[PDB]
Amino acid sequence: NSNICEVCNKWGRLFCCDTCPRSFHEHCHIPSVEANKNPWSCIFCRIKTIQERCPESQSGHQESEVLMRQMLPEEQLKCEFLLLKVYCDSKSCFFASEPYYNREGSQGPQKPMWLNKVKTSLNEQMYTRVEGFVQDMRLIFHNHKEFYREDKFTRLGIQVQDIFEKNFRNIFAIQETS
Ligand SMILES: [Zn+2]
Ligand SMILES: [Zn+2]
Ligand SMILES: [Zn+2]
């Protein structure tokens, strides 16, 4: 197994996947690494299993259809993984914890949002459809773009949103387009 966490790329107290060579800190894995279970399979392995059990799940989908899916266990898992993939980028640090807004010439968003809040919401099963999760994720970056206006810092929101969107299209097998 790897000697660094897959998500944050640091050593420490790591839990090792039994079915692939990835390792995780306890709270870097999503969901948090489970207490017992030997063997243990990581979220990357669990996602691969879903695809292997239903190869047709990789045929292209319409986003509108994906968003209306109820958050049954497989969709819950896919959202957990998608959230994890965003945490895997180091620029996610900017969007992880609760922001505050005090900049001359801007007003903060009406509905602040951040990754750790989405993480809690997933953990507490607060989303009933995929749409709920996707709307909160997109709101994080939209709020950032709106607040930072022409500061070049706006680009961080564009960057992390692109990681979100690419991973969304991959995980939920959205039909490729030009
Ligand atoms: Zn970590
Ligand atoms: Zn694994
Ligand atoms: Zn099948």
Closest ligand to residue 32's CA:
1
Is residue 136 within 8 Å of 118, Cβ to Cβ? yes
| Co-location of 64 and 120 in the same domain | yes
| Ligand 2 centroid from CA 44, angstroms | 5
> What is the span of the domain harbouring residue 32?
1-59
- For residues 108 and 38, membership in a common domain is answered with no
The count of domains in the chain is 2
User: For residue 135, how far is its CA from the centre of ligand 1 (angstroms)?
Assistant: 26
Beta carbons within 8 Å of 158's beta carbon, 6+ residues apart: 141, 145
Q: Nearest Cα to 84, choosing from 167, 21, 157?
A: 167
- Say yes or no: 43 and 75 in one domain: no
Task: Let me know whether 6 and 73 are in one domain.
Answer: no
DSSP 34: P
Q: Helix (H) and strand (E) counts for the chain? A: 7, 2
Q: Does residue 54 share a domain with residue 65?
A: no
Q: Verify that 64 and 95 share a domain, yes or no.
A: yes
Last residue of a domain, one of 30, 59, 88: 59
CA 52 to ligand 3 centroid distance, Å: 8
Distance 42 CA to ligand 3 centre (A): 22
> Of the candidates 66, 92, 21, 15, which has an alpha carbon nearest to the alpha carbon of residue 172?
66
Q: Both 105 and 165 in a single domain?
A: yes
Sign of CA dihedral 123, 28, 108, 159: negative
Q: Are residues 1 and 29 in the same domain?
A: yes
Contacts of 56 (CB under 8 A, 6+ apart): none
DSSP reduced 3-state for 53 = helix
Classify the C-alpha dihedral 26-87-173-80 as positive or negative.
positive
Ligand 3 centroid from CA 169, angstroms: 21
How far apart are alpha carbons 159 and 118 in whole angstroms? 19
| Integer Rg of the chain from CA | 17
Residues lining ligand 3 (ion), CB within 5 A? 54
**Strand, helix or coil at 178?**
coil
Measured CA to CA, the distance from residue 75 to residue 175 in angstroms comes to: 17
Let me know whether 135 and 157 are in one domain. Answer: yes
Separation of alpha carbons 178 and 164, rounded Å: 18
**In a shared domain, residues 90 and 171:** yes
- Residue 23 parent element (H or E): strand 23-24
How far is the centre of ligand 2, averaged over its atoms, from the C-alpha of 68 (Å)?
Answer: 29
Of 59, 80, 100, the residue that ends a domain is 59
Distance 87 CA to ligand 1 centre (A): 9
Ligand 3 centroid–CA 35 distance in Å is 31
Is the same domain home to 122 and 150?
Answer: yes
